Structures are given as C-alpha cells and as structure tokens.
Amino acid sequence: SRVCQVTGKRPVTGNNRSHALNATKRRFLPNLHSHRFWVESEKRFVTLRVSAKGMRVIDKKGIDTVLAELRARGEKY
Amino acid sequence: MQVILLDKVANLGSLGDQVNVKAGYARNFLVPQGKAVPATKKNIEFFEARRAELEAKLAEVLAAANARAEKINALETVTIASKAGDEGKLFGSIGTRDIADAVTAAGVEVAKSEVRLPNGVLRTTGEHEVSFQVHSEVFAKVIVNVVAE
Amino acid sequence: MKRTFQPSVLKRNRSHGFRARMATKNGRQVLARRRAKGRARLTVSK
Amino acid sequence: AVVKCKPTSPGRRHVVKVVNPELHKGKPFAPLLEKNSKSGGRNNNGRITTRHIGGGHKQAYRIVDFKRNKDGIPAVVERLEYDPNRSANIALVLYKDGERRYILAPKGLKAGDQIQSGVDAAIKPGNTLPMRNIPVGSTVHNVEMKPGKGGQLARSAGTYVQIVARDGAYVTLRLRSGEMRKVEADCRATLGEVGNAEHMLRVLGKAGAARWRGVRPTVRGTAMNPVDHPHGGGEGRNFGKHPVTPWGVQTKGKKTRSNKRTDKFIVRRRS
RNA sequence: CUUUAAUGUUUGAUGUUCUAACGUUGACCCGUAAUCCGGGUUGCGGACAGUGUCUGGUGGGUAGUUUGACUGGGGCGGUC
RNA sequence: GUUUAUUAAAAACACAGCACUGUGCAAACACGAAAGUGGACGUAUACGGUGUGACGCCUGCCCGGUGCCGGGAGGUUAAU
RNA sequence: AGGACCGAACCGACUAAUGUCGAAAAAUUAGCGGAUGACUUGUGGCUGGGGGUGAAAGGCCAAUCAAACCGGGAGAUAGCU
C-alpha cells in the first residue's frame, strides 16, 4: 500500500475545484520512493518505502532512532 | 547541510569544517563510505577532542600503509599469455578479474575494485599503460604486455 | 425447447453451495442475512 | 518449393502451398516438447485483451535454444523439422558429447552440416559468434540486445540484419525494418539468414485456412454501431470521421513510440 | 556617465566524463525438489528514465446538463 | 460460411487477397488506481489498428479546410 | 485431395397451411438448406452491468436488455390523470 513507513503518510481523498467551481473527487498520493538506507548497527543496507518528507527526518534524526521507533510501532522493515 | 568530514575530499576536503553539502550527496556517498558523520550540536563536541587530532594519525597510517604496500613490486610490470587470434582478434575480452588474480598470485597483494582500466579494457594485444588509484592523491603506473601464444 | 434450467447437482453445489458461499466475504454476508431471517434452508444442498 | 494447385473447386482455387521436401516426416523429439495451452486472447482477468485471436489446431511448444551457450562443442545437424510456433523451420542439432537441441535453421543449413558456437568458431553459416568477432558488413540473425538474454532480433523466416558500423564497444545494426540500432558488442549473434524465405508465397487460399491457424474474423468499425465503435452509424455507409482505434486513439499516421529510455540506442527511425 | 579589460562572487542554459541514488521482464549463487519474491556477486544503463505535488495544451474516451414562448396542430417563416 | 433465440437469413456480416498506418520488444495496444497478465514463451516474411473485399483491366486531378507527420526565425503563452 | 457432389442421423429454420382464450408463452404437418467441416455435440471451467460477449442484429447475457436481476437511498419527483 502507498503508505510511508516513517511518517505514516497515506493517500488522502479530496476535491479538485475547476474554474467553474465544479467538484470532482481526486486523491493526493504521497511522494513515496523505495530507498536503501545504510545502517552501521547491522552493517548492512535496509530497503524502505519512504516519502520525501520521510527521507528528510531520517537525514536529520539518527537512522538508528528511526529504526528503533519503527520497531516500537510494530512495523516490519 | 552541515556535516563534519573525516577523509580528504578533493574539492571541499578540510578535515572537519562546516561546509554546506547537498543532502543527497551526503546520504548516497559520504555516510555509507564513512567519509563523514552527521554532526548537529552533538558530534561537534566529540570531534573537537576525540577526533580533531586523534583520528588524524589513525587516518594517515592507512595512507602510509597503502603507499608502502603499493610499491611492493619493484619490477612494476605485468605479463600475461593469451591465445589471441591469428593476426589480431584476441580470443575474448578480459576485464580486471584475471589481472587482479595474476597480480595476487605473483606480485602485489591488491583487491579487486582497486584495479582501474583507463585505456579501454585491454583489447588489442601489445604494451599498454594502466593507472591504479590506491589513494585520493596517489597514482601508480604499471605496464601490461599481452603475449600471443 | 431447451428451457433455461438444466439441473446439475455438481454445478449447483459449486455455484451456490455452503463452501462456495463461505469462500468469499459477500457469500458470508448472504449466510448471515439468511440466519437473521431464520430460513430453514440456509443454502442449497442434498 | 512453391506449388500452385489446380482450380478443382472454390476454396482450393487460390491456395498456394509451400512444400518443403527435406522436412522430417515423423514425430518430433519428445524430450524437447512442452505443452502450450491456447489463451484465446484472454488474460489473467479473463477479459479479451487482444482481439481476433482464438481457436486453431492444437500445437506443442518446442524448446528452441536461442542462447547457444555450448561454446567450443561442434555439433552435427540431425534433420530439419516443422515447428508450428515459428514462421521458420527448426533444426535438430546433435552435439559431439551426445545431447540434442533445437535451433533456428538458416538458409544454407541442411542435414549433415557442421556448426559450432563461441569465438573459436569458423564463419560458416549457422555458427554463433559475438559481433566483435564477426566482420563488419556481414549478415546475421537471432541477435541479442543484452549478453545472455538469448536473442530477439531477426527470428522470423528469411530475416537478417547487417553490421553497418563498429563503434568500439558498440555495434550498429540495420534491421529489415530499416531501423539502425546500437547494440552492445559482447552479446552474441548467429551468422546467415533465417531459412524458409518463401513464406510470402503462401496465400492460405480460403477463409478457413486462417481460422485453424488461430485467427478469428475481423469486424470493420463501419459495420459496428455508434456505441461500440467510434465509427458506425448512419444510413448508407457514412464515415465522415477521421480513422481511429476502437478506444479513440487516432490511427493512420500517429506515432505511438514514447519510451525515452531506449532512445539512446536508436540512430535513425523507419523510412 | 558613454565606451573596455584581469583576479575573486552570484550563477544559469548547454556539452563531456564518473558512480554512490535509482532502473534492470541481463547473468551467476543462496534461501529453495521454486519460471514468483528477497538477499549477495557482477554486467549494462544512470542523475536520465520513472513516480509524487503544481501547472499549460490536448481530450465526446467518459460524465452531468442545456437546446424559449407565441402559433387558427406542430415545424419552417415571422414576432417578443 | 455467419446474423436480428420469438414477424426481416438478405444486396447485410465474414471471407481469402490488397493497401495504408503503428510497433525494435520492458514493443505498440488492451484489461488493471497498482502489482501483474494478454499480445507471446512471438519479435518486422512478426504483431495491432483501419479501409477495401476472389480474380481480370485499372484506381485520374486537388494539400485550401479538418487531421496527421516534420521544421523552425519571430510573436503569444502557466506554474515558478 | 476437396470450407467437393447427391443424401439419412445430426444441426439449421427458406415457403405454405394449421394453430393465436393453441397440444406448445414460436410448435406441428408437407416440402426446403448444410451434412469431413469456418462442422456438430456431452462434461467442466473463464469473461459481471456504464460491464461482458458479439462473422456486428443495439443482437445475446436464466421466457425481461438503447444498459440484466435483487435489496436499499425511497413514501425519489410528478405544474399531470
């Protein structure tokens, strides 16, 4: 599913107002990408499905901290 | 992004200066290769003392070891016998696995990725010049002569 | 005149049998609705 | 050979047969067979994804060796056989070690011939060589695009490609469609051109010949109704519309090539 | 100010090379008696392709609707 | 040969053949929010679409308009 | 050899009559077409409703199809009877 494994971002439905204000149901998808992060704790690469925002928080916060939080959440990477 | 540097980068290498770098560049290259560590108010303190000067020797010794090991072979020449075709048209193209194995068997003790082929992949038989990149600023020249059998 | 209904026990069971209904959730809902209505014959079967 | 039958009756009047006397009149090699259940154009969803496909005579799949990985092992040609799957005939090849394989039969191939694979091979037709070893300007078939893939180019009957240029690690191929493609050198190719070059001369004769060949009747858009096809409708064969596919895509001169990934390997387009 | 020319600066379009992101419905090994899938090794592509957000164009492929009244029936014509 | 099961079996539909056009294979295209399947375990003597409809003699003139393909000086032109 | 010929089974349904509260919610009787093929048939699977399938009739999809059937929104709305 198109669900970010870090921030939990999921597709959200919404309308697309036109010039004449007409409403049609659309869906905003997260900017998910499959990325391979290098973790020194296991000295290996772990593949994750993350969004642009998710990759920023990983870049700022420790990779280990994100994994530890991810394990606590109960999601298997 | 701000990141402390351990290795000597050709362009922005100054051993631990707050120089802006692209986040993707750090994630893809510096972090996996151990050439930098993400320092944000925390690793800066550790670097000033435990790494400002202590790690300098630990980094130079590797450079010294590479320099001494990569002059192990005084001859600095490689000869390989191949069953090349009549009047050219060598049997099959040879990459780096064969030369690396031959060098390891008799010559310098070198890894696989350490071998670089600047002039093609040594297709035409004869003498060729090959450059080995053992350090960020150390270049080694070796002469390879393929002998047709 | 071949009428529409051509009986076949095997096809009848494999199309509207208990196991067929329970395989998919919608059939499970059908059984639930039958039970709520209290029908004597929950499904088709010998 | 091409033989035209006598107009004994309609349906046989226009038949043009292609009789090949040297074909094998017997059962194929069972060890190399493999069942091939027809699909009828349906996909996993069960819907018709490709139209005008269905029926036809049962046919068994023959495992044809396209990779030709037996390098340096001369092999003799036992015989030639009819493969219903390909437009070209296939040849049963017996290797020196004693294993039998199927290969595409080029024009010059016949029973009792000798073939070999790998760089240490001659330039006789049917041999498998990498393009780097094949001289420029020669004709090859069953060409690969990536090493070890197996070969995809020039596989039909009477088809071949030319070695027009050799740019170091890459080779340029001129295909029968007039397409000039850049291909990696190390990947393999087979010398000569595919045999059975007289596949055009056949005409199938009658309607049912296409029917048991796996092809179903095609219905013109005009004969259709307005709802089911963009064409159709009106009294008296009225068209008054630009030709289009049944799904609205405008046909008849609208390029549908949009890859942006393999374009780097394209030198010139069709002309 | 009109009119010029070095070094340093902000740089952006363009071209070349590289690989570490990414792609691989290439090859080999393992999980595994497995054409899936994952991992490893390697090759070929490569900051392109592809995907997300924003935006211009195209778009009866599809959808929701409209298409007036008078009237010596209605339509046409005329009128408001 | 096929068709309006149940008022129309035909000149209608299909048809072999012919032509145009798309597609270099991770093919075009189609079904799928996607994965993945069909096309095809095929790859241009192949596949899809479109029109015509055995065969014989042929298939003329026009590129303004509407499409399609190619080019690019200049103008216009969104987000930013 | 043949989408060859005549012609039963088998498949089809061109003509006429009968039958229209019929024996039958398209049949019977007398002729008629194909009958080694694009044939016909048994069994079991797959395609699900803005869809399927269609040698193409808007035909067919459980005696209903220019958008099936069942339940619900729903006591839809009805300047009309």
From Swiss-Prot, chain A:
Name of the protein in its database record: Large ribosomal subunit protein bL28
Subunit: Part of the 50S ribosomal subunit.
GO cellular component: cytoplasm; cytosol; cytosolic large ribosomal subunit
Record's keyword annotation contains Ribosomal protein: yes
Transcription regulation among keywords: no
GO molecular function terms listed in the Swiss-Prot or TrEMBL record: rRNA binding; structural constituent of ribosome
Keywords associated with the record: Ribonucleoprotein, Ribosomal protein, RNA-binding, rRNA-binding
Assigned protein family: Belongs to the bacterial ribosomal protein bL28 family.
Superkingdom field: Bacteria
SUPFAM superfamilies: L28p-like
Organism lineage: Bacteria, Pseudomonadati, Pseudomonadota, Gammaproteobacteria, Enterobacterales
Curated annotation (Swiss-Prot), chain B:
Cleaved signal peptide residues: none
InterPro entries for the chain: Ribosomal_bL9, Ribosomal_bL9/RNase_H1_N, Ribosomal_bL9_bac/chp, Ribosomal_bL9_C, Ribosomal_bL9_C_sf, Ribosomal_bL9_N, Ribosomal_bL9_N_sf
Keywords: Acetylation, Ribonucleoprotein, Ribosomal protein, RNA-binding, rRNA-binding
PROSITE patterns noted in UniProt: RIBOSOMAL_L9 (PS00651)
Modified residues (N6-acetyllysine): K89
The UniProt record lists the keyword Ribonucleoprotein: yes
GO cellular component: cytoplasm; cytosol; cytosolic large ribosomal subunit
One Pfam family per UniProt: Ribosomal_L9_C
GO molecular function: large ribosomal subunit rRNA binding; structural constituent of ribosome
Described function: One of the primary rRNA binding proteins, it binds very close to the 3' end of the 23S rRNA.
NCBIfam families to which the protein is assigned, alphabetical: L9
UniProt subunit comment: Part of the 50S ribosomal subunit. In stalled/collided disomes (pairs of ribosomes where the leading ribosome is stalled and a second ribosome has collided with it) bL9 in the collided ribosome contacts bS6 and uL2, while it contacts only helices of the 16S rRNA in the stalled ribosome; the inter-ribosome bridge thus formed is different from that formed between normally translating ribosomes.
Protein name per UniProt: Large ribosomal subunit protein bL9
Organism: Escherichia coli (strain K12)
UniProtKB/Swiss-Prot annotation, chain C:
Keyword tags: Ribonucleoprotein, Ribosomal protein
PROSITE patterns: RIBOSOMAL_L34
GO terms of biological process kind: cytoplasmic translation
GO cellular component annotations of the record: cytoplasm; cytosolic large ribosomal subunit
InterPro entries per record: Ribosomal_bL34 (IPR000271), Ribosomal_bL34_CS (IPR020939)
Pfam families in UniProt: Ribosomal_L34 (PF00468)
Molecular function per GO: structural constituent of ribosome
Assembly and interaction partners: Part of the 50S ribosomal subunit.
Family of the protein in this entry: Belongs to the bacterial ribosomal protein bL34 family.
Protein name: Large ribosomal subunit protein bL34
Gene this chain is encoded by: rpmH
UniProtKB/Swiss-Prot annotation, chain D:
GO molecular function, one term: rRNA binding
Modified-residue entries (N6-acetyllysine), positions: K241
Spans annotated as Disordered: 27-52, 220-271
Disulfide topology: none
GO CC, alphabetical: cytoplasm; cytosol; cytosolic large ribosomal subunit; DnaA-L2 complex
Database matches in Pfam families: Ribosomal_L2 (PF00181), Ribosomal_L2_C (PF03947)
UniProt keyword Acetylation, yes or no: yes
Biased composition (Low complexity): 38-47
Keywords: Acetylation, Ribonucleoprotein, Ribosomal protein, RNA-binding, rRNA-binding
InterPro entries given in the database record: NA-bd_OB-fold, Rib_uL2_dom2, Ribosomal_uL2, Ribosomal_uL2_bac/org-type, Ribosomal_uL2_C, Ribosomal_uL2_CS, Ribosomal_uL2_dom3, Ribosomal_uL2_RNA-bd_dom
Gene Ontology BP terms: cytoplasmic translation; negative regulation of DNA-templated DNA replication initiation; ribosomal large subunit assembly
SMART domains: Ribosomal_L2, Ribosomal_L2_C
Keyword field contains Ribonucleoprotein: yes
NCBIfam families per record: rplB_bact (TIGR01171)
Assembly behavior: Part of the 50S ribosomal subunit. Forms a bridge to the 30S subunit in the 70S ribosome, contacting the 16S rRNA. Interacts weakly with S6 in one of the 3.5 A resolved structures. In pull-down experiments interacts with CedA.
PANTHER family (UniProt xref): LARGE RIBOSOMAL SUBUNIT PROTEIN UL2M, RIBOSOMAL PROTEIN L2
Family statement: Belongs to the universal ribosomal protein uL2 family.
UniProt function note: One of the primary rRNA binding proteins. Located near the base of the L1 stalk, it is probably also mobile. Required for association of the 30S and 50S subunits to form the 70S ribosome, for tRNA binding and peptide bond formation. It has been suggested to have peptidyltransferase activity; this is highly controversial.
Native species: Escherichia coli (strain K12)
